[PDB]
Design an enzyme around this catalytic site. Structure first.
Site, short mmCIF file in Angstrom:
data_model
loop_
_atom_site.label_atom_id
_atom_site.label_comp_id
_atom_site.label_asym_id
_atom_site.label_seq_id
_atom_site.Cartn_x
_atom_site.Cartn_y
_atom_site.Cartn_z
CE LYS A 1 6.19 69.37 60.31
NZ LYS A 1 6.17 68.23 61.27
N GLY B 1 -2.86 72.25 55.89
CA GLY B 1 -2.99 72.72 57.26
C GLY B 1 -1.81 73.57 57.71
CB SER B 2 -1.19 76.75 58.84
OG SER B 2 -1.53 76.86 57.46
N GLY B 3 0.10 75.20 61.40
CA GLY B 3 0.19 75.19 62.85
C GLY B 3 1.38 76.00 63.30
N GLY C 1 4.91 74.53 61.54
CA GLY C 1 4.95 74.13 60.14
C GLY C 1 3.64 74.29 59.41
CG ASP D 1 0.98 63.56 69.67
OD1 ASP D 1 0.00 63.12 70.31
OD2 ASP D 1 0.96 64.66 69.09
C1 LIG Z 1 4.77 66.68 54.97
C2 LIG Z 1 5.20 66.03 56.28
C3 LIG Z 1 6.59 65.87 56.51
C4 LIG Z 1 7.04 65.27 57.71
C5 LIG Z 1 6.11 64.84 58.68
N1 LIG Z 1 6.61 64.23 59.86
C6 LIG Z 1 6.24 63.07 60.49
O1 LIG Z 1 5.33 62.34 60.10
C7 LIG Z 1 7.02 62.71 61.72
C8 LIG Z 1 7.68 63.70 62.48
C9 LIG Z 1 8.42 63.34 63.63
C10 LIG Z 1 8.49 61.98 64.02
C11 LIG Z 1 7.84 60.98 63.26
C12 LIG Z 1 7.90 59.50 63.66
C13 LIG Z 1 8.91 58.71 62.82
C14 LIG Z 1 8.23 59.28 65.15
C15 LIG Z 1 6.58 58.90 63.39
N2 LIG Z 1 5.54 58.42 63.19
C16 LIG Z 1 7.10 61.35 62.11
C17 LIG Z 1 4.72 64.99 58.45
C18 LIG Z 1 4.26 65.60 57.25
N3 LIG Z 1 2.93 65.73 57.05
C19 LIG Z 1 2.08 65.18 56.15
C20 LIG Z 1 2.52 64.12 55.33
C21 LIG Z 1 1.65 63.53 54.38
C22 LIG Z 1 0.33 64.01 54.25
N4 LIG Z 1 -0.54 63.42 53.31
C23 LIG Z 1 -1.76 63.88 53.21
N5 LIG Z 1 -2.27 64.91 53.96
C24 LIG Z 1 -3.67 65.31 53.74
C25 LIG Z 1 -1.53 65.56 54.92
O2 LIG Z 1 -1.95 66.49 55.61
C26 LIG Z 1 -0.11 65.07 55.07
C27 LIG Z 1 0.76 65.66 56.02
#
Ligand SMILES: Cc1ccc(NC(=O)c2cccc(C(C)(C)C#N)c2)cc1Nc1ccc2ncn(C)c(=O)c2c1
EC number: 2.7.11.1
Length: 262
Positions: free
Chosen positions: A36, A17-19, A22, A129
Protein backbone atom coordinates in the site's frame (compact mmCIF):
# COMPACT_ATOMS: atom_id res chain seq x y z
CA UNK A 1 13.67 -2.63 16.08
CA UNK A 2 14.02 -1.42 12.48
CA UNK A 3 11.71 -2.54 9.66
CA UNK A 4 12.55 -0.25 6.75
CA UNK A 5 12.79 -1.99 3.39
CA UNK A 6 15.36 -0.29 1.09
CA UNK A 7 14.19 0.92 -2.31
CA UNK A 8 14.22 -1.51 -5.22
CA UNK A 9 13.86 -4.64 -3.09
CA UNK A 10 10.10 -4.91 -3.62
CA UNK A 11 8.82 -5.86 -7.07
CA UNK A 12 5.53 -4.01 -7.52
CA UNK A 13 3.27 -6.47 -9.31
CA UNK A 14 -0.36 -6.07 -10.26
CA UNK A 15 -2.52 -3.18 -9.02
CA UNK A 16 -5.38 -4.19 -6.74
CA UNK A 17 -7.39 -1.22 -5.44
CA UNK A 18 -7.03 2.55 -5.37
CA UNK A 19 -8.64 5.12 -3.07
CA UNK A 20 -8.21 8.68 -1.81
CA UNK A 21 -5.69 7.48 0.79
CA UNK A 22 -3.49 4.93 -0.95
CA UNK A 23 -3.10 2.49 -3.82
CA UNK A 24 -2.53 -1.24 -3.17
CA UNK A 25 -0.41 -3.61 -5.26
CA UNK A 26 0.42 -7.30 -5.07
CA UNK A 27 4.19 -7.71 -4.90
CA UNK A 28 7.32 -9.79 -4.49
CA UNK A 29 9.47 -9.43 -1.36
CA UNK A 30 10.87 -12.70 0.05
CA UNK A 31 7.63 -14.24 -1.23
CA UNK A 32 4.28 -12.66 -2.03
CA UNK A 33 3.38 -9.40 -0.29
CA UNK A 34 0.79 -6.64 -0.33
CA UNK A 35 2.04 -3.09 -0.89
CA UNK A 36 0.00 0.00 0.00
CA UNK A 37 1.51 3.30 -1.07
CA UNK A 38 0.11 6.49 0.34
CA UNK A 39 1.35 9.07 -2.20
CA UNK A 40 2.46 9.53 -5.81
CA UNK A 41 4.35 12.86 -5.73
CA UNK A 42 4.54 15.34 -2.84
CA UNK A 43 4.25 13.74 0.63
CA UNK A 44 2.03 16.05 2.74
CA UNK A 45 2.95 16.76 6.38
CA UNK A 46 -0.49 15.18 7.09
CA UNK A 47 0.32 12.17 4.89
CA UNK A 48 3.75 11.84 6.51
CA UNK A 49 2.18 11.98 9.98
CA UNK A 50 -0.57 9.48 9.10
CA UNK A 51 2.08 7.22 7.57
CA UNK A 52 3.94 7.22 10.89
CA UNK A 53 0.70 6.65 12.82
CA UNK A 54 -0.36 3.64 10.72
CA UNK A 55 3.06 1.95 10.77
CA UNK A 56 3.33 2.70 14.51
CA UNK A 57 -0.05 1.09 15.24
CA UNK A 58 0.60 -1.88 12.92
CA UNK A 59 3.96 -2.79 14.49
CA UNK A 60 2.31 -3.16 17.93
CA UNK A 61 0.53 -6.22 16.54
CA UNK A 62 1.71 -9.84 16.43
CA UNK A 63 -1.34 -12.13 16.23
CA UNK A 64 -2.57 -14.75 13.72
CA UNK A 65 -5.96 -13.04 13.43
CA UNK A 66 -4.48 -9.63 12.56
CA UNK A 67 -2.91 -8.79 9.18
CA UNK A 68 0.83 -9.36 9.40
CA UNK A 69 2.83 -6.15 9.04
CA UNK A 70 6.17 -6.89 7.38
CA UNK A 71 7.82 -3.55 6.64
CA UNK A 72 7.60 0.02 5.42
CA UNK A 73 9.31 2.09 2.73
CA UNK A 74 9.86 5.86 2.45
CA UNK A 75 11.92 6.11 -0.75
CA UNK A 76 10.64 6.63 -3.45
CA UNK A 77 7.14 6.93 -1.96
CA UNK A 78 5.56 6.26 1.43
CA UNK A 79 4.63 2.56 1.47
CA UNK A 80 3.49 -0.12 3.92
CA UNK A 81 4.21 -3.79 3.22
CA UNK A 82 2.10 -6.56 4.70
CA UNK A 83 1.54 -10.27 4.08
CA UNK A 84 -0.40 -11.15 0.94
CA UNK A 85 -3.91 -12.45 1.60
CA UNK A 86 -5.19 -15.31 -0.50
CA UNK A 87 -9.00 -15.46 -0.78
CA UNK A 88 -11.86 -13.01 -0.19
CA UNK A 89 -13.14 -10.65 2.50
CA UNK A 90 -16.12 -11.77 4.59
CA UNK A 91 -18.21 -9.02 2.95
CA UNK A 92 -17.37 -10.46 -0.45
CA UNK A 93 -18.25 -14.02 0.56
CA UNK A 94 -21.61 -13.20 2.15
CA UNK A 95 -22.98 -10.41 0.00
CA UNK A 96 -21.54 -10.91 -3.48
CA UNK A 97 -20.97 -14.63 -4.03
CA UNK A 98 -23.22 -15.83 -1.17
CA UNK A 99 -20.99 -18.67 -0.02
CA UNK A 100 -23.35 -20.76 2.09
CA UNK A 101 -21.25 -21.41 5.18
CA UNK A 102 -22.32 -23.93 7.77
CA UNK A 103 -23.15 -22.87 11.32
CA UNK A 104 -19.98 -24.48 12.70
CA UNK A 105 -17.91 -22.44 10.23
CA UNK A 106 -19.88 -19.18 10.72
CA UNK A 107 -19.47 -19.38 14.52
CA UNK A 108 -15.77 -20.10 13.96
CA UNK A 109 -15.40 -16.99 11.77
CA UNK A 110 -17.12 -15.01 14.54
CA UNK A 111 -14.76 -16.64 17.05
CA UNK A 112 -11.57 -15.78 15.17
CA UNK A 113 -12.76 -12.20 14.70
CA UNK A 114 -13.49 -11.86 18.42
CA UNK A 115 -10.08 -13.44 19.07
CA UNK A 116 -8.33 -10.71 17.08
CA UNK A 117 -10.49 -7.87 18.33
CA UNK A 118 -9.71 -9.08 21.84
CA UNK A 119 -6.01 -8.78 21.02
CA UNK A 120 -6.32 -5.30 19.47
CA UNK A 121 -8.24 -3.96 22.45
CA UNK A 122 -5.82 -5.64 24.83
CA UNK A 123 -3.06 -3.81 22.96
CA UNK A 124 -4.88 -0.47 23.54
CA UNK A 125 -5.96 -0.31 19.89
CA UNK A 126 -9.39 0.82 18.73
CA UNK A 127 -10.18 -0.31 15.18
CA UNK A 128 -12.72 2.46 14.39
CA UNK A 129 -13.91 0.76 11.16
CA UNK A 130 -14.71 -2.89 11.74
CA UNK A 131 -16.90 -4.48 9.08
CA UNK A 132 -17.12 -7.70 7.10
CA UNK A 133 -14.94 -5.93 4.50
CA UNK A 134 -12.01 -5.78 6.91
CA UNK A 135 -12.51 -9.42 7.87
CA UNK A 136 -10.35 -11.32 5.41
CA UNK A 137 -10.98 -15.06 5.12
CA UNK A 138 -7.35 -15.91 4.37
CA UNK A 139 -7.06 -19.36 2.82
CA UNK A 140 -10.79 -19.61 3.71
CA UNK A 141 -9.60 -20.93 7.10
CA UNK A 142 -8.00 -18.09 9.06
CA UNK A 143 -9.59 -14.71 9.70
CA UNK A 144 -7.22 -11.78 9.30
CA UNK A 145 -8.46 -8.45 10.63
CA UNK A 146 -7.00 -5.36 8.99
CA UNK A 147 -8.11 -2.01 7.65
CA UNK A 148 -8.30 -2.47 3.89
CA UNK A 149 -10.19 0.81 3.59
CA UNK A 150 -8.74 3.36 1.20
CA UNK A 151 -11.33 6.15 1.60
CA UNK A 152 -10.44 7.05 5.21
CA UNK A 153 -7.16 8.62 6.47
CA UNK A 154 -5.84 5.99 8.92
CA UNK A 155 -4.43 8.44 11.52
CA UNK A 156 -17.78 6.13 6.10
CA UNK A 157 -19.35 2.67 6.35
CA UNK A 158 -22.54 3.65 8.12
CA UNK A 159 -24.18 0.29 8.87
CA UNK A 160 -21.53 -0.77 11.37
CA UNK A 161 -21.58 2.55 13.26
CA UNK A 162 -22.88 2.73 16.83
CA UNK A 163 -25.65 5.27 17.63
CA UNK A 164 -23.31 7.47 19.76
CA UNK A 165 -20.81 7.47 16.89
CA UNK A 166 -23.57 8.09 14.33
CA UNK A 167 -24.82 10.95 16.54
CA UNK A 168 -22.28 13.51 17.71
CA UNK A 169 -20.66 13.49 21.12
CA UNK A 170 -17.98 16.21 21.49
CA UNK A 171 -14.68 14.81 20.10
CA UNK A 172 -14.24 11.07 20.76
CA UNK A 173 -17.30 8.79 20.47
CA UNK A 174 -14.92 5.91 19.70
CA UNK A 175 -14.42 3.27 22.35
CA UNK A 176 -14.05 -0.48 22.74
CA UNK A 177 -17.86 -0.63 22.72
CA UNK A 178 -18.05 1.33 19.47
CA UNK A 179 -15.96 -1.53 18.06
CA UNK A 180 -18.21 -4.04 19.82
CA UNK A 181 -21.36 -2.70 18.14
CA UNK A 182 -19.62 -3.08 14.77
CA UNK A 183 -18.90 -6.69 15.77
CA UNK A 184 -22.60 -7.05 16.60
CA UNK A 185 -23.54 -6.02 13.06
CA UNK A 186 -20.87 -8.47 11.83
CA UNK A 187 -22.54 -11.23 13.86
CA UNK A 188 -25.85 -10.14 12.35
CA UNK A 189 -24.19 -10.47 8.92
CA UNK A 190 -23.13 -14.05 9.64
CA UNK A 191 -26.54 -15.05 11.03
CA UNK A 192 -28.77 -13.37 8.46
CA UNK A 193 -26.31 -13.51 5.54
CA UNK A 194 -27.61 -10.00 4.91
CA UNK A 195 -26.80 -6.34 5.48
CA UNK A 196 -28.90 -4.44 8.03
CA UNK A 197 -31.70 -2.17 6.79
CA UNK A 198 -31.62 -3.67 3.28
CA UNK A 199 -35.23 -2.47 2.83
CA UNK A 200 -34.39 1.21 3.33
CA UNK A 201 -32.87 2.88 0.27
CA UNK A 202 -32.06 6.22 1.91
CA UNK A 203 -28.72 6.82 3.64
CA UNK A 204 -29.53 10.04 5.50
CA UNK A 205 -32.62 8.48 7.09
CA UNK A 206 -30.65 5.44 8.29
CA UNK A 207 -27.99 7.69 9.81
CA UNK A 208 -30.67 9.81 11.49
CA UNK A 209 -32.72 6.87 12.82
CA UNK A 210 -29.87 4.69 14.14
CA UNK A 211 -28.70 7.80 16.02
CA UNK A 212 -32.09 8.43 17.63
CA UNK A 213 -32.63 4.70 18.14
CA UNK A 214 -35.75 4.63 15.96
CA UNK A 215 -34.13 1.95 13.80
CA UNK A 216 -32.19 -1.17 14.83
CA UNK A 217 -31.13 -4.45 13.20
CA UNK A 218 -34.19 -6.67 12.78
CA UNK A 219 -32.89 -9.55 14.92
CA UNK A 220 -35.82 -11.81 14.05
CA UNK A 221 -34.06 -12.39 10.72
CA UNK A 222 -31.44 -14.84 12.02
CA UNK A 223 -31.11 -18.22 10.26
CA UNK A 224 -33.26 -20.72 12.18
CA UNK A 225 -30.34 -23.13 12.73
CA UNK A 226 -28.51 -20.35 14.64
CA UNK A 227 -27.99 -21.01 18.39
CA UNK A 228 -30.20 -19.07 20.82
CA UNK A 229 -27.15 -18.15 22.91
CA UNK A 230 -25.67 -16.47 19.81
CA UNK A 231 -28.81 -14.44 19.14
CA UNK A 232 -28.70 -13.32 22.78
CA UNK A 233 -25.02 -12.35 22.58
CA UNK A 234 -25.74 -10.49 19.35
CA UNK A 235 -28.38 -8.36 21.10
CA UNK A 236 -25.93 -7.60 23.95
CA UNK A 237 -23.37 -6.30 21.45
CA UNK A 238 -25.99 -4.18 19.67
CA UNK A 239 -27.43 -2.41 22.73
CA UNK A 240 -28.18 1.25 21.91
CA UNK A 241 -26.77 2.44 25.24
CA UNK A 242 -22.97 2.31 24.97
CA UNK A 243 -22.15 1.21 28.55
CA UNK A 244 -24.59 -1.74 28.35
CA UNK A 245 -22.41 -3.62 25.82
CA UNK A 246 -20.01 -6.47 26.72
CA UNK A 247 -16.24 -6.09 26.26
CA UNK A 248 -14.19 -8.55 24.21
CA UNK A 249 -12.77 -10.86 26.90
CA UNK A 250 -16.43 -11.49 27.80
CA UNK A 251 -17.64 -11.79 24.19
CA UNK A 252 -14.85 -14.23 23.38
CA UNK A 253 -15.66 -16.34 26.44
CA UNK A 254 -19.33 -16.44 25.46
CA UNK A 255 -18.70 -17.54 21.86
CA UNK A 256 -16.35 -20.32 22.95
CA UNK A 257 -19.08 -21.69 25.24
CA UNK A 258 -21.65 -22.30 22.47
CA UNK A 259 -18.93 -23.49 20.08
CA UNK A 260 -18.01 -26.49 22.27
CA UNK A 261 -21.52 -27.95 22.61
CA UNK A 262 -22.64 -28.33 18.98
C1 LIG B 1 -0.94 -3.23 2.07
C2 LIG B 1 -1.61 -2.72 3.35
C3 LIG B 1 -0.79 -2.08 4.31
C4 LIG B 1 -1.36 -1.60 5.50
C5 LIG B 1 -2.74 -1.74 5.74
N1 LIG B 1 -3.26 -1.24 6.97
C6 LIG B 1 -4.09 -1.83 7.88
O1 LIG B 1 -4.56 -2.96 7.76
C7 LIG B 1 -4.41 -1.02 9.10
C8 LIG B 1 -4.34 0.40 9.07
C9 LIG B 1 -4.65 1.15 10.23
C10 LIG B 1 -5.02 0.48 11.42
C11 LIG B 1 -5.09 -0.93 11.46
C12 LIG B 1 -5.49 -1.68 12.74
C13 LIG B 1 -4.27 -2.26 13.48
C14 LIG B 1 -6.30 -0.82 13.72
C15 LIG B 1 -6.32 -2.83 12.35
N2 LIG B 1 -6.98 -3.74 12.05
C16 LIG B 1 -4.78 -1.67 10.29
C17 LIG B 1 -3.56 -2.38 4.79
C18 LIG B 1 -3.00 -2.87 3.58
N3 LIG B 1 -3.80 -3.48 2.68
C19 LIG B 1 -3.86 -4.76 2.23
C20 LIG B 1 -3.11 -5.77 2.88
C21 LIG B 1 -3.15 -7.11 2.43
C22 LIG B 1 -3.96 -7.44 1.32
N4 LIG B 1 -4.00 -8.77 0.86
C23 LIG B 1 -4.76 -9.06 -0.17
N5 LIG B 1 -5.53 -8.15 -0.86
C24 LIG B 1 -6.33 -8.63 -1.99
C25 LIG B 1 -5.56 -6.82 -0.51
O2 LIG B 1 -6.24 -5.97 -1.10
C26 LIG B 1 -4.71 -6.44 0.67
C27 LIG B 1 -4.67 -5.10 1.12
Amino acid sequence: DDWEIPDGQITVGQRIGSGSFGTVYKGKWHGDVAVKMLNVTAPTPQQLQAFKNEVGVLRKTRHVNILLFMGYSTKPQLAIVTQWCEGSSLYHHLHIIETKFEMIKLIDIARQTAQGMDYLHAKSIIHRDLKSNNIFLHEDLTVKIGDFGLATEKSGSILWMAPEVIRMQDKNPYSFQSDVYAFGIVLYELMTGQLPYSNINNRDQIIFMVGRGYLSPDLSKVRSNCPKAMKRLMAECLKKKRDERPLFPQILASIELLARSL
